[PDB]
RNA sequence: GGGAGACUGGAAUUCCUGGUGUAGCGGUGGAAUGCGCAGAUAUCAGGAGGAACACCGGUGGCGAAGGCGGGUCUCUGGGCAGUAACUGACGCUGAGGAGCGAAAGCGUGGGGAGCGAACAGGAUUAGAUACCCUGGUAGUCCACGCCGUAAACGGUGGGUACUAGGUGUGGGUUUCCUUGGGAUCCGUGCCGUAGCUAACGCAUUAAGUACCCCGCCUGGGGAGUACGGCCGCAAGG
């Protein structure tokens, strides 16, 4: 079909990511 | 096999071609060369499609079935008639 | 100073600028000009009019020294081979022989990227 | 993956009958040198991929057949089980 | 055993004379290990297509050894491991 | 290599030598020499080389380096044991006069295969042969640096020198530090590689077992007093309050060899990276 | 019949030549009505 | 090129990578393996060349 | 070009050495950062190293899917035809589970030519942290292991009997010529009626006529997210 989905999907993992990249580190010192 | 030789094939003069607005881009796998501003065509490939073309036409005719021609242009129609008025078989002049 | 009858001539034409050098049999070149050295600069140097000019300019330089007759060896693609050629055989020298030496790797080094532009 | 008199013994020795071919233990007989010979190989080439799934196919194979001869008659099936020395 | 036909191109600044005792010593190591039937053919003094080496002709041969995988391997590697050896090409005639 | 279990903190990440492809567990009673250890201490009694002190004893195991001798004599490896002096294992030969010898048992040394010295030698790996007669293009360990002077090139575990293109009197030789260096054709080589590759990832896990190799504690000089070393302690941790310098003032600079020595035979030093 | 001014991916079995000569057309239609007729002859 | 073969169809010949001749008769002026479709072969005597052309080149019976 | 292990060679780029050799070379729609006058660029000879193997090389071949083509040697899986001999239902699917599994990334010891994440600058733009140019760390390579992610697309599961066919291609066999055609069974192509559909399109290699089995759904975001659990050194699934 179209790619408006796809991009929706796209941007929610991108944003998902970032927030995992930006916790990382408080993951980390939580898991340790 | 072969039937017609390229010597006749050339004599007949059936390698010219149109203009250069008037030219196929899809058309690389057939052009040669380009004399005089006219696009001249392969030899080897069409003299193995000629053969290819006879086996497919008897395959047809094997199976049954004949061939149908068509035409419009006001200078070979009396030709097309009489071909088929000779060979039994459809025309449209 | 020396003296050489004949030799070969070698026509490195990119899409920037043709080097042509003019050398002995054996490897030793003796004279050789381009577009920058002629004048032309930048893209300038991508034009056949300066290609012609640093093959004639060669081609002088040469027989200064004594050449008479080269053998053309010409490089990779690129605009103004052909006119290098004719240069060459109209400031007083013999074509003798063409060869086309183009180095053709077999998938050899990758290349760059392409271009997005 | 086996010559013509390797094979013909095995089939000579496992067989029910003479000029027997195809029958369970003889197949079984087969599959069980066929996987040898490529437990073998893999062993020497422990990174084939291609060699371990025809193994694990032919073992899928003599697993069917054993089960087959165990519905069938489990005194063939024991007997065939102790004299090839498997489980 | 297996056929194998072995082409060497040896040293071209040594004589046609010493090719074939030298190819005889070579393959004893065979005719002892496995025995087999020996074809030599020497066409030596011909031009090479590019420099091998820093040589510009070289001296051919064909030899067939009906004989084994490791035997045949043994003796390549001796001609390679050899000095006056320059190249060498083992084939399979049988199927490959 | 065999990595410890974490039972205690010693042995967090501790590995150790696998000990495989050795097959007696004691030396030869005949070629063991005795030696004591010095503690780094010249003649003069004076601590000269730092950070050596008290381990385990250990034999001399002597081996001959060489193998001038025994030229069309073969001999066949016995034992693969341990050499605490060396850092690869080392092989017994039994020569077919009746003496026995010491390798350092280059990789894929087995047991039972036979070696034999001499220049009419085959190219394998355990056996001696001159330059002059091994091919250009091999790998060769601890094969010399003058005629008859016994190896000193390439003798530790997993190393090896790549004989290059030879040409006249000398052959080029790429040691394992990447110099290109020249060697008379005259000398006696080893073909093969120095086995032990696995060596140099064994994690000693506690100072206890460098301790026993006989190593002392090392003493940074940032902890030091100004009349000890040259970077002096001051109040704090301190970078070293100067340049790095060596703790006689000799700052990190080439170092090498005095100017205009006979190394004629060097032709490209090694790279930093 | 192609020419220069023909496509290949509709057309699937080219045969190459002209069209615009009269005397070329009339050569091939005699050419093909000689490939039918011994075509027929087989039956 | 538009014929059977010469190996397919006359089945009294072999590919053989000594023969010198047969395969310069074969590769291009400038030393390159001429197409299927300009040689007329089968595939199989098509990859058998291609594999002699090759055992030439690197035993140095061609000039590549 | 089905995979694994070993040996070996050519083109090409880079670097160094020995000759010839000047004041430019690289680059862009135009321009310079970069390389030079300490001898740049360029050509001949020699040496070092690593990725990949032009031409054969394609709507072509193999593999369960990824995926796979320089040459040689050892082992091995899969498939087709003919004889049609052998046991005679042993046939198909498969919840969990196990194995393989594109690229990217991490540990160990190496190597690193070219390309090239990040990073530096040169240039346009009002703003370029990008598209363009110049150097380049990880990465791309080798052996031991790891996560199991792709538009892993034929977006179409495996198996069975049937549905005008037309026509190129690879393979094994037969009747008619006596090199050419028909028949035989599988894959790979493209059209096409019957049939299917919302149309695109499929149409003997179904998306059609019938059946066994597994997985998924009952509106889009929230969210393939948080919680708890599982795998995993970590990212991560
Ligand atoms: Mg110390
Ligand atoms: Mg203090
Ligand atoms: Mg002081
Ligand atoms: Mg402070
Ligand atoms: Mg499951
Ligand atoms: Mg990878
Ligand atoms: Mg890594
Ligand atoms: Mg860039
Ligand atoms: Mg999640």
Redesign the pocket.
Known sequence: ?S?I??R??RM??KK??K???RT?VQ??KL?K | ?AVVTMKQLLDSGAHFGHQTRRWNPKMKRFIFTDRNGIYIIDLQQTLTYI???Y??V???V??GGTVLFVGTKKQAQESIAEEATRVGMPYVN | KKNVPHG?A?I?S????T?V?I??P???????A????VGF??????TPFAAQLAAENAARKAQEHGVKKVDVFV?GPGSGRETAIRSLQAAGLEVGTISD?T??????????????? | ??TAEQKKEILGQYG??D??????E?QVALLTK?IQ??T??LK???????????????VGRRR??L??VA??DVARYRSLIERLGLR | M?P?EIMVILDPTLDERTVAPSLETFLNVIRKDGGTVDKVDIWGRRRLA???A?HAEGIYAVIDVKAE?AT??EL?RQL?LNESVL?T????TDK? | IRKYKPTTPGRRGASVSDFAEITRSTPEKSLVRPLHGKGGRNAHGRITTRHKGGGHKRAYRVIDFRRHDKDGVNAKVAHIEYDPNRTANIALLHYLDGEKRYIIAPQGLKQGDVIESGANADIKPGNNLPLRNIPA?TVIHAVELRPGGGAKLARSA?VSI?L??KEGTYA?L?MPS?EIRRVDVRCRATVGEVGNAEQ??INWGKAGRMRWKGKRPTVRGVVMNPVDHPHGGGEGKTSGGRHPVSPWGKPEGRTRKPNKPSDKLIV?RRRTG | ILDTNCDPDVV??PIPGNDDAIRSAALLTKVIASAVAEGLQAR | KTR?CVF????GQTIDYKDTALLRTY??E????????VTGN???H??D???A???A??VALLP?
Request: with cysteine; net charge positive; hydrophobic share 25%.
């Open positions: 079909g790619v989905k796809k929706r999907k929610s993992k998902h990511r927030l995992l990249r990382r993951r980390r898991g | 096999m053969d290819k073309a086996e497919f008897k395959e047809t094997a199976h | 070969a070698h490195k990119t899409f920037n600028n080097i050098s050398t002995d054996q490897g030793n070149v003796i004279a050789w381009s577009s920058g050295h600069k930048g893209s300038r140097k991508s490089k030496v180095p053709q790797p077999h998938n050899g080094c990758r290349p760059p990227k392409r271009r997005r532009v | 993956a086996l029910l009958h000029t027997d071919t195809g029958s369970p003889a066929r010979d490529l073998e190989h020497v080439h422990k990174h084939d991929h291609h060699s371990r799934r025809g193994l694990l196919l032919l069917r057949l089960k087959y519905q069938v | 297996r194998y590019y420099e091998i820093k995988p045949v391997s390549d390679n190249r090409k083992v084939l399979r490959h | 293009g997993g790549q290059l293109g080029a790429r990447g140099s990832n490209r | 699937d079995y | 059977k397919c169809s006359k089945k590769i291009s400038r030393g390159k393996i001429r197409a299927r479709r089968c595939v199989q098509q990859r060349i291609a594999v052309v090759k055992n080149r690197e590549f």
